[model samples]
Structures are given as C-alpha cells and as structure tokens.
Target: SMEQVAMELRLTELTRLLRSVLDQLQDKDPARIFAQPVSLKEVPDYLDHIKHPMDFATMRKRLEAQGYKNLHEFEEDFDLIIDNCMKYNARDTVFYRAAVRLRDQGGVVLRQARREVDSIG
Candidate 1:
C-alpha cells in the first residue's frame, strides 16, 4: 500500500507537469494552430502526408484521462504534433515555421520541468 501510494503521487505529479507544459505550448501558439485537430477540407493532403495526426486538444483529453504512462509517452505525443505539421507543410509556410518554434519552446519547457523536479528532490 505504501508503494502504491507513492506511485500514485508520482503519476499525479507527472500529470500536472504535462498539463502545465501543454498550457505553455498553447500560449506560445498565439494563432491557435495546434489547439485543435487539422481539418481535411482545409488541407486536403494532410492525411496522406502525415499518417499519425496529433493536436493540443487531443493531448489534453489524453492527459485528463490519464492515458500517458510516463513522461516519455507525453513527450512522444507532443513531438508527433510538431512532426506532423512540419511534414505536411512547406518549410517556408507559417504552419511549418510555427511547428519549428513550438519544437524549440517545448524543449525549453521540458528542460525546465526536469530542473524543477531535481530542485524539488
């Protein structure tokens, strides 16, 4: 029971960390491009270009449901969101540029989270 309690505490902390990361990412995206799933009508070839699509709203739901088992799992979904956008759009386009910026910002955010965990420990 003690171990189980500690495990739950860890999971809850991870969940909260991921949520704040999501919030920061969304804030960086002022245009809200990553906030929702892509529309096939707007980008006709989106599905063809990126097999696995990810978005902030979807990630939020997963986090709320406690779908992620660990930090890496949450990060994977975040990476997929950026990767999918970059692959689907041209390098010079807004979507691609935004994806790049988000990727950079995400790295910073995650690094900060790691430092925080270490400090707290």
Candidate 2:
C-alpha cells in the first residue's frame, strides 16, 4: 500500500532531521553514527505494520539458502547479541524477540534474492 511508502518517507525525514539538527555533536565520528532499521521504541503493532524482509527470520532463511549453512551456528553469535542486549537491559524485551525467533524458527524468509520481490512491499 501507499501507506508503507509514506511511512518510509516520514521515517527517513525524521532520522535526517533528528540526527543532523537536534542530536548533532561537533566531535562525533560520522562512522560511529548509525541508524538501525527499527523503531527506537518497540511498538506493539510493529510487526503487523512493517513488512520488510530483513526483519530477522526472513533474512535468516534467505542467508541460509545462499549457502551460508550456518543460521544458528556458533553459540558465540547468540552470546554476543544476548550479551549486549543484557548489558542494555533488553532481557524479555522486543529487542531480542526477533533474534530469538531467528535462532529458532529459522526459515520464515524467502527464495533466491528475487524470488519474492513483489510480495515484500
């Protein structure tokens, strides 16, 4: 729907204005400045409204299908994310929900990169 496009535009503008104006730091390293592809706060209806495939599960499957062979390989990967999330007090929060899902559900993603283009939007 056009609403998705509208929301994307709005979010972009917000990130631009917020970072460039209100949150700007004179000595901040531009490389250290990053914007994750998620809301700063988890919204209850977030997954319901957003349809981006990079949202964990889909990405996991997509990567595995590409011969990445290791979706949940190395417990260290989970440890790193869990370790940081805990440091930031993300225990039982939505922040780790998708990561947990990715580590578990495995293949809710897609086919070849182009296999499911139209439905993604």
Candidate 3:
C-alpha cells in the first residue's frame, strides 16, 4: 500500500508538469490549427502525405487517459505534432510557420519545466 502511494505521487508530479507544458503549447497556437486533428475534408491528401498525425487535442486526450508512461513518451507525441506539420505543409504556409514557432517556444517551456523537475530532484 505504501509503495503504491509512492508511485502515485510520482505520476501526479509528472502529470502536472505535462499539463502545464501542454497549456503553454496551446497558447502558442494562435491560429488553433494544431489545436485539433487535421480535417480530411479540408485537406483530403493529409493522410496520404503524413504517416502519423498528432495534435494538442489528441495529446490532451492521451494525457487525460494516462496513455503515457514517461515524460519522454509525451515528448514523442509532441515532437510528432511538429514533424507532421512540417512534412505536410510547405515553408511558405501558415501551418509550417506556426510549427516552427511552436518548436522554438515549446522547447523553452519544456526546458523550464525540466529544470524544475531537476531542481526537485
């Protein structure tokens, strides 16, 4: 029972960190394009170009579902969101620019949270 409680504490800490980082990312998406899944009706060829798609809404769902096992796993999905955007959209497009900005801004958010984690260590 004691060990189970200890594990829960660790998970709670990780979940809080993940949530804050996610919030920061959502704020950075001004157009809200990455806020949800890419609409196939709008971009019918999206799935044809992108093998794996990711978005903040999906990440939020997964986070709430406790689908992630570690911080790195969460980052994998975050990174996938950026990669998928870059792959499907060209440099001149709005989505591409937003992804670039998100990668930069989101990196800062992640690093700051990571430093907090390290300090807590």
CA lDDT of each prediction against the hidden true structure: 0.85, 0.35, 0.86
From the highest TM-score down, the ranking of the candidates is 3, 1, 2
The total of clashing pairs for model 3 equals 0
Give one digit per residue, the lDDT tens place, for model 1 in 1-121. Answer: 9999998888788788778878987888898989999988988877887888999999999999878867678889989999988887899999999999988877888888777655754
- The number of the candidate with the highest lDDT is 3
The lDDT, on a scale of 0 to 1, for candidate 3 is: 0.86
Pull out the clashing pairs in model 3.
none
The TM-score between candidate 3 and the true structure equals: 0.90
Preferred candidate (lDDT higher): 1 or 3: 3
Cα lDDT for residue 90, model 3?
Answer: 93
- The TM-score values for the models, in the order shown, are 0.86, 0.23, 0.90
| lDDT of candidate model 2 versus the reference | 0.35
